[PDB]
């Protein structure tokens, strides 16, 4: 995340997926070396929303890191679309518009998968 307090910048929004992941990584590389009550109020809720989104990366085992892969069967009811179909014919904002009727259910399912994964290695 690229801000004075740290939060991601829109690196190359109009770029289609296959280049935009590369620019997400180069976003990271340049971003961390680039790093009256209105200002205080705004950056306190910036802290609050930041710690919120890092707790979403916290409770999926992702520990506050990008490109964090977890083990969920991505249902064809959420999207029947093929990989290269969306990953070379689309950008990211219209795909978030596509699946904004599922994001609470996706956070639901990744949380059962993370607690299931840690409870199973808690067994093993």
């Amino acid at each position, epitope marked *: 995340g690229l801000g004075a307090m740290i939060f991601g910048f829109l690196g190359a929004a109009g770029s289609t997926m296959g280049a935009a992941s590369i620019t997400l990584t180069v976003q990271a590389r340049q971003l961390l070396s680039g790093i009256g009550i209105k200002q205080l109020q705004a950056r306190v809720l910036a802290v609050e929303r930041y710690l919120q989104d890092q707790k979403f990366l916290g409770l999926w085992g992702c520990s506050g890191k990008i490109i964090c892969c977890t083990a969920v069967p991505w249902n064809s009811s959420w999207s029947n679309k093929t990989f290269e179909e969306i990953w070379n014919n689309m950008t990211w*904002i*219209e795909w978030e*518009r596509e699946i*904004s009727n599922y994001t609470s259910q996706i956070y639901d399912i990744l949380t059962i998968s993370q607690t299931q994964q840690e409870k199973n290695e808690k067994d093993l």
Partner: nanobody
Amino acid sequence: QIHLVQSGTEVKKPGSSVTVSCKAYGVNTFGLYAVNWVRQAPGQSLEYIGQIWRWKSSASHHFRGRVLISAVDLTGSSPPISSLEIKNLTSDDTAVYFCTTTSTYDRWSGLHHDGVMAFSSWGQGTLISV
């Protein structure tokens, strides 16, 4: 609020050409709003024809190269007005026509999707007989 009217009911000759207006009393522009031209055969269900959407005129492959749509937005005496024009009205073109504006500003509302869109506020439908 938004309201739509258009031209009246016109009956013409086979092999004529027709134009149908679209006066949008409430559209702040047709830059951000988009309008849609939809036919309806007598009794038969409604069929899409064409649209204007950020000043890209389009019609269907059932209407490419024969039917033409225009739009001039908000001027002084005139509200934003589109217009559907058809040459060579066959007996198939005997239909009720429709103009409808959609709000395309807040991109995550879901009334629209990348050119195609759900049609917010209709007019009165115009009979055209051949």
